[PDB]
Amino acid sequence: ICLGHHAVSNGTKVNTLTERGVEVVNATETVERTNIPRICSKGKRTVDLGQCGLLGTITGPPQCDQFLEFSADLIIERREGSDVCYPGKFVNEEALRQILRESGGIDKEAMGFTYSGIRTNGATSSCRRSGSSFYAEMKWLLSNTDNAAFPQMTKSYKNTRKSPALIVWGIHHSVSTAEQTKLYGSGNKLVTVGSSNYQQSFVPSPGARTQVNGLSGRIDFHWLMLNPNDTVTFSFNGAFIAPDRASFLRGKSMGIQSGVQVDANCEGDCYHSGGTIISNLPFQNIDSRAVGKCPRYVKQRSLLLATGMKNVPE
Amino acid sequence: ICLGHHAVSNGTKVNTLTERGVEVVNATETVERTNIPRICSKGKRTVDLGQCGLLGTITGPPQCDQFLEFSADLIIERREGSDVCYPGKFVNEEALRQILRESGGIDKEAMGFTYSGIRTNGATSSCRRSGSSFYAEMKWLLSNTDNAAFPQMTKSYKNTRKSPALIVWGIHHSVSTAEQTKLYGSGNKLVTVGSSNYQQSFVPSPGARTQVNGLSGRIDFHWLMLNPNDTVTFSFNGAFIAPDRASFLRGKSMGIQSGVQVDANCEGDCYHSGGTIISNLPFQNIDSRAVGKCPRYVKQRSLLLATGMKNVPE
Amino acid sequence: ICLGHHAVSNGTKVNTLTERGVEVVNATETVERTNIPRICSKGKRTVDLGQCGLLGTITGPPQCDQFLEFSADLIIERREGSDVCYPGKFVNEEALRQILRESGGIDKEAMGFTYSGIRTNGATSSCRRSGSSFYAEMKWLLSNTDNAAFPQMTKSYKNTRKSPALIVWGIHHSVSTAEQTKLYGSGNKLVTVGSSNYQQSFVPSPGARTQVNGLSGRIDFHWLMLNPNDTVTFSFNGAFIAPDRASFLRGKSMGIQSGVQVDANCEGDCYHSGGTIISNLPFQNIDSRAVGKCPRYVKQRSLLLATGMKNVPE
Amino acid sequence: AGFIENGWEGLIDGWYGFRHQNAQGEGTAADYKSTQSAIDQITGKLNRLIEKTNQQFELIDNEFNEVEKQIGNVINWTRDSITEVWSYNAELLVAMENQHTIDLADSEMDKLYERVKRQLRENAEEDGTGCFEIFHKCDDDCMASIRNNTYDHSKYREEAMQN
Amino acid sequence: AGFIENGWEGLIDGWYGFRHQNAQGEGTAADYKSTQSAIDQITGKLNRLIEKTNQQFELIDNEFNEVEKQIGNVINWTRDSITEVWSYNAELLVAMENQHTIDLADSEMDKLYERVKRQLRENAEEDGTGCFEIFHKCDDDCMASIRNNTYDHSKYREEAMQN
Amino acid sequence: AGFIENGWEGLIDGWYGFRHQNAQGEGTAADYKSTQSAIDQITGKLNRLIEKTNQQFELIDNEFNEVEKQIGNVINWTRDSITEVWSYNAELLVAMENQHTIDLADSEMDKLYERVKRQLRENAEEDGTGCFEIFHKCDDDCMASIRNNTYDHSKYREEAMQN
Numbered sequence A, B, C: 001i002c003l004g005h006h007a008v009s010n011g012t013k014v015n016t017l018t019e020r021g022v023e024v025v026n027a028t029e030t031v032e033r034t035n036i037p038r039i040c041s042k043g044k045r046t047v048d049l050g051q052c053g054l055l056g057t058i059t060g061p062p063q064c065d066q067f068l069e070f071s072a073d074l075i076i077e078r079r080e081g082s083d084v085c086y087p088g089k090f091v092n093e094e095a096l097r098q099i100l101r102e103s104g105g106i107d108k109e110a111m112g113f114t115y116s117g118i119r120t121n122g123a124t125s126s127c128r129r130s131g132s133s134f135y136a137e138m139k140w141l142l143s144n145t146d147n148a149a150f151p152q153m154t155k156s157y158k159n160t161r162k163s164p165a166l167i168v169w170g171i172h173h174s175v176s177t178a179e180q181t182k183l184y185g186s187g188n189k190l191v192t193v194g195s196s197n198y199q200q201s202f203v204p205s206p207g208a209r210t211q212v213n214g215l216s217g218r219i220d221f222h223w224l225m226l227n228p229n230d231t232v233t234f235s236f237n238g239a240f241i242a243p244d245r246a247s248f249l250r251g252k253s254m255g256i257q258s259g260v261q262v263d264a265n266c267e268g269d270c271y272h273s274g275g276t277i278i279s280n281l282p283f284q285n286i287d288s289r290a291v292g293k294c295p296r297y298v299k300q301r302s303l304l305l306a307t308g309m310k311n312v313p314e
Numbered sequence D, E, F: 001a002g003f004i005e006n007g008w009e010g011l012i013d014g015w016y017g018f019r020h021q022n023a024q025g026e027g028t029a030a031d032y033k034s035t036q037s038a039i040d041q042i043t044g045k046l047n048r049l050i051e052k053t054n055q056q057f058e059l060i061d062n063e064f065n066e067v068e069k070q071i072g073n074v075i076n077w078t079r080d081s082i083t084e085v086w087s088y089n090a091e092l093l094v095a096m097e098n099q100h101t102i103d104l105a106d107s108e109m110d111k112l113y114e115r116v117k118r119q120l121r122e123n124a125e126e127d128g129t130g131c132f133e134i135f136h137k138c139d140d141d142c143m144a145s146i147r148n149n150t151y152d153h154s155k156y157r158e159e160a161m162q163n
């Protein structure tokens, strides 16, 4: 009586420690290549920012009016999103983005800044709503008559909650020094900030820069995080975009950047700009910058794991 | 005659390439979990900074008066430590901390700055000793009468040793512009620094910031490292905290941050905030930020290595 | 009839999973230690910068006059290289270096800045050619008579090509405020830059700093990258080192820093400061900072791979 | 898969099996214990390698607004290093697991053959190519007694000893 | 640990051993060479895996005064990547070493059995479950001669050949 | 390399071989199939381990003009971590490959011996130390017939059976 093993006509070549191209009976794939060209968001609270920028949700341009107090498990950034309506830029913008991606949403709260002796309803043609408007969460602080002067003012706000608050103020860089004297008066202007961990200086710099939204001046946005039972102070005297409401982190979430469609039919925890990687394999060769609970990215496009024996045909 | 192997009633389950939960005869642990809740400092020169901050040892607040010229193999930072007595902040503070942790101690040396035509004994109510004092290694440069003016002064110091020197100066940000004119006189003030590798500008910014130690003004500390046979120059004219002595690194050491007690009975080379990891295992699941000669941190809490054969009972 | 294996008198000890020091028949090395003390540049376009600095090729000091429009596959930086002839420093210098190392060379193009009402032929004793010269790609903008005043000027340049352009301007920090008023006139000076992605402020700071090349003043170099069909704007009024020509990246290359000789006889893709690592082994114990297509650096100096059987002699 | 010169492509019933030719016809029936053992081992390998790490990684770069060039080159440098590490680990992992899988199948085959050999003390003798030459004519029911490990090791002894 | 259906819990004398039952009573005595070999191999594994790397790592973060958020997220990102790498390496390391340890013990057992078999040319025959049926009554001193590898391979031949 | 007490230093002809002493003199001739198999396997190991990764890494530090101390300590920290990872991977890689190489050579030796044994059904008997005691005088041409796997398994049977 004889005894032997089985074989097949068409095997599957794999690689071993000894040889490279051993024909075995059966094999499987370990490096995922298939991609779902959608954002699988089944069972998750998804907020597609769209034309609204992630940082704008703190300042509140028109395009972010519907994102001032959002709550999400999965936050999506779009390429058409913009953080500003009036031309400007954030300082340490990427750090604040990485803070807001895992925030789980934001919760605004009025800071209660009352002003006596100045005007507080500045606007511009860029930030447009019914007419000429401004940031929803900010107040453009100006002087009382056209020209005049700005009194040395000092405000303060104490965080009366258990979570750190997000404080964002602005510095207006005018188109020219004469226009800065037109809005806030002549003389040097200083917008002093203060807290237990932060505080700084922040002098404006009026100068005719370029054109982006169609204007020339700018507004630089700065931010800090107030600890519980800590106080912030603003000793300013001109060129100040005062904050009206502070932000508080809701919980935990994840932020991604993509350009594909949202799909609540499929479920996935690994995302990239091209879609969702739904796989149980330990490796993937799709995108090295994938975020979430992803298989480890490798350079090889295929690595066949042997599931059968050595294939020796007649 | 028969022949076989041994077995036990109660085995030890491990994991293999094939199965998960194979009962073997004997096994050992590879992931360390036991922790000594003390700083094992046997045989090492240990300097517990306590209420003194690591950077303060260069400037010399009261709480660091006993740490101006220390020498250690193991430096310990405490949470109650403070780098300043007068309110202020260091620029690139963490870099200087990482420099001083492995310095092996510091060695001060007088720089020899003589002043003709100004006053040089400023103090404050915060930095308190017998009465109103100041930083031990610094000299608050002021004007000669109350108000008056500050002459454009220029000092210089050459490193006459084989190791790079640590130069630290200060910039006083007054509570108001009128008080800055009271201490240093009216007009613009510029504290120019200079060397072969460094040099800069450093204009002060007087402004009523918040309250920390009880005051409003500030003093920002800046530093550079002079190469051997290199010269530093200070062309200043007001708001200057001049350095009195420079620092030199002694050798090599290690710096840690912890809140547990010092113990000269046990010996260890791996430290964390909770204590000392004394182990010969290749892995540990205690603290991912452990410093020293530590086992590699892993996420698994237990990984049993098989030391016996397959346990097959009757 | 008997049957057995072979052996040798002098074996080779290796390490296994079980023992450490197993004498096997034959073994080979896996950790490369041999080094070629030359820069193997066979078949590559090599540009040895020498006394010219990598950043200088954009500004154009005398020592870089022969490197204004180079093209290379392998760029070599030398320790004697200098980026400046007039004393100064680059802002974000290492980023620009890492950009220029893989640029494959640079291609200059005239920006076409015409000036009406000022002088544009500044020079200095440091940047020397036939007499007192200046940077080749820059124009020191001054006033028309000795002293006088500088008119508020505004220039602009649009990138009319498919690749991003490299724009570099300068800010002159005078030896004193009186000399700055001598070159550009009294009053505040502001050198505003502008683009779709960049734009900034850049106020000069006149102050008598140290001596390096023999002078006291400085010139800080700043840079941006213009996207295709994007425009840059310069609203300046004094202390301006205007750019004459912009730079465009040619393709792809690699930049190294070494102090050994160039050799077009040997070929290598792994370089370090001491020479070229020519090896097929997967590991090397020469330099952990080696660049190119290198074997992975390890700490072990030798790891013997067994190529023979167990050596059991009589 | 050693001296067994080739495999039985017609054995679509399992991995290992018996094929006998005595006097009552032909026989080809697969074995269940060895095949099931190898299948459970490979299945354990797959169930162990297929794994979803609960470690979540957040965004560190930015695709729409590129971060600073220096910190960006540091991030890219680190990500490329980690990518090299995981590519190496994947290569060596797959290669080693394939080697141990092939050697595992060969080992199970050798265990089957050694068991069937030890079941036949002196009733049959070896030939050369994984077969057992019988010296007493073993009918189909006796072959089935060999398959299910019930063939007696003495009740056919002296009949085949003198042959 | 293959066809040996179970282990001897009473054998607290070593890993492997002999248990005979002839006519002068019972016997159970452990073997020293194979047991000592396996013990030295496992001991070598432990002495190699237990290792204190002389590489010292300094502080890169700060627990009392948090560094900048961007560079801090870069540091945390790198540390998490390295943590994943070392967790993978530890998992695969322990699993592989356990596999090779079990297969090593089984291999040493097979070497013991094969040696005792080759020591008995034709004086005894195989049965099925790791035993050796003797055809000449071997007393206790003869069993001891089998244990210490001194049993003659011909001085008891034709006595057990005719049986 | 197990019970074979030592190796033949004079066998400079190959890895494995035969050395016989019958009645027509002495014999020592190497075997080609097993030796060539082991040589091809080790050669495959070397061809797989020797590899030039096409991954190019650029400069991230600066040797002539040191970068900022903080980002420099981050870069040094990451490079040291990666260096530890690759040192570990190299150590474990070399150790594992050496283990599998030695066990591979021993396995090929055991395959050679088992093949030569199975080629001799009952014409020769085992002794103890990897030799085959012949009971019929096999001349040099018969030894050559054993080497090239052409020795008949029955045409010398009953001549050596009665011995």
Ligand SMILES: *[C@@H]1O[C@H](CO)[C@@H](O)[C@H](O)[C@H]1NC(C)=O
Residues within 6 Å of the ligand: A026, A027, A028, A307
């Ligand atoms: C071969 O392996 C694949 C792995 O996905 C599996 O789905 C399939 O059922 C296997 N087939 C056989 C015949 O083993």
Ligand SMILES: *[C@@H]1O[C@H](CO)[C@@H](O)[C@H](O)[C@H]1NC(C)=O
Residues within 6 Å of the ligand: A228, A229
């Ligand atoms: C914050 O201040 C309130 C004011 O009374 C106090 O009740 C609370 O305990 C404080 N919390 C902390 C964490 O200090």
Ligand SMILES: *[C@@H]1O[C@H](CO)[C@@H](O)[C@H](O)[C@H]1NC(C)=O
Residues within 6 Å of the ligand: B026, B027, B028, B307
């Ligand atoms: C089992 O392993 C542990 C490992 O720490 C060892 O201390 C112990 O002596 C071992 N015991 C036996 C019976 O092998």
Ligand SMILES: *[C@@H]1O[C@H](CO)[C@@H](O)[C@H](O)[C@H]1NC(C)=O
Residues within 6 Å of the ligand: B228, B229
């Ligand atoms: C530093 O300067 C002194 C002054 O004479 C000289 O003796 C010494 O050699 C110099 N050292 C170096 C390293 O340049």
Ligand SMILES: *[C@@H]1O[C@H](CO)[C@@H](O)[C@H](O)[C@H]1NC(C)=O
Residues within 6 Å of the ligand: C026, C027, C028, C307
């Ligand atoms: C031993 O290995 C080395 C590896 O470089 C090889 O060059 C040499 O030919 C080998 N010699 C023998 C006898 O195997």
Ligand SMILES: *[C@@H]1O[C@H](CO)[C@@H](O)[C@H](O)[C@H]1NC(C)=O
Residues within 6 Å of the ligand: C228, C229
């Ligand atoms: C750039 O502008 C020119 C001007 O007509 C146009 O032809 C070209 O298509 C533009 N390219 C891009 C990429 O916008």
Ligand SMILES: *[C@@H]1O[C@H](CO)[C@@H](O)[C@H](O)[C@H]1NC(C)=O
Residues within 6 Å of the ligand: D068, D069, D070, D071, D072, D073, D076
């Ligand atoms: C990092 O790599 C990506 C491509 O993977 C590239 O688009 C990006 O520009 C790189 N970052 C930097 C700072 O060069």
Ligand SMILES: *[C@@H]1O[C@H](CO)[C@@H](O)[C@H](O)[C@H]1NC(C)=O
Residues within 6 Å of the ligand: E068, E069, E070, E071, E072, E073, E076
């Ligand atoms: C890094 O992780 C630690 C916890 O392991 C956390 O406390 C810290 O805030 C993190 N750093 C940043 C910058 O988020």
Ligand SMILES: *[C@@H]1O[C@H](CO)[C@@H](O)[C@H](O)[C@H]1NC(C)=O
Residues within 6 Å of the ligand: F068, F069, F070, F071, F072, F073, F076
């Ligand atoms: C990094 O390490 C090198 C030596 O490998 C050292 O010269 C350099 O100073 C280190 N960098 C920093 C920032 O300490």
